């Protein structure tokens, strides 16, 4: 369902989201153009996600509901879990620097992967299409 290669198509309020997350105006400008590709593979509860962008090419492996660490592109550490809630992946992370929650949701709406992000009151969306 999520299992596919997804290339970002458009985003909503992502600049304010990034600015709230502490991203400087130079990397925000770049990020508007990051060309984020997610390649998601699922086996039962074990997921592999290859994130490719104009910043980096990494692979993140996680299990549903097993807390893991993930470094953002500026080296900010997140600690948290992904879960399945009905049809959605639910991400509950905290930054380990200030403990503030970064909550996120992946859902398929039609043929788009829609990822919502919420951080300190600011909500953004990134929408992906199949490659
Ligand atoms: C290169 N630099 C400096 C950056 C560019 C653009 C955005 C950046 C964000 S951000 O917070 O605004 N956007 C990224 C948020 C990702 C949060 C998702 C957490 C879920 C972990 C994903 C693991 C997986 O793929 O399953 C944070 C830190 C650095 C950023
Ligand atoms: Mg992401």
Where residue 130 sits, what CATH number does that domain have?
2.40.128.20
What is the distance of C-alpha 85 from the center of its chain?
Answer: 17
Minimum CA distance residue for ligand 1 atom 5: 31
- For the chain, what is the domain count? 1
User: Ligand 1, closest atom to CA 124?
Assistant: 12
Minimum CA distance residue for ligand 1 atom 18: 104
Task: Answer whether 119's CB lies under 8 Å from 99's CB.
Answer: no
Task: Answer whether 94's CB lies under 8 Å from 100's CB.
Answer: yes
Q: How far apart are CA 111 and CA 76, in angstroms?
A: 31
Determine the distance separating the centroid of ligand 2 and the alpha carbon of 51, expressed in angstroms: 8
Give the dihedral sign, CA 58/31/12/15.
Answer: positive
Task: Answer whether 40's CB lies under 8 Å from 49's CB.
Answer: yes
Task: For residue 126, list its beta bridge partners.
Answer: 11, 115
27 CB within 6 A, ligand 1 = yes
Q: By residue range, what is the domain housing residue 32?
A: 1-131
21 CB within 6 A, ligand 1 = yes
51 CB within 6 A, ligand 1 = yes
With residues binned 3-state (H G I as helix, E B as strand, rest as coil), the percentages for the chain, rounded to 5, are 10, 60, 30
Minimum CA distance residue for ligand 1 atom 25: 49
């Amino acid at each position: 369902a999520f299992d596919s290669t997804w290339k970002v198509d458009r985003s909503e309020n992502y600049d304010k989201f990034m600015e709230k997350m502490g991203v400087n105006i130079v990397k925000r400008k770049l990020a508007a153009h990051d060309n984020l590709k997610l390649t998601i593979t699922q086996e039962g509860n074990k997921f592999t996600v290859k994130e490719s962008s104009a910043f980096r090419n990494i692979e993140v492996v996680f299990e549903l509901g097993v807390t893991f660490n993930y470094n953002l592109a500026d080296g900010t550490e997140l600690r948290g879990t992904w879960s399945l809630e009905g049809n959605k992946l639910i991400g509950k992370f905290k930054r380990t620097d200030n403990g503030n929650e970064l909550n996120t949701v992946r859902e398929i709406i039609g043929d788009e992967l829609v990822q919502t992000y919420v951080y300190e009151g600011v909500e953004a969306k990134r929408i992906f299409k199949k490659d």
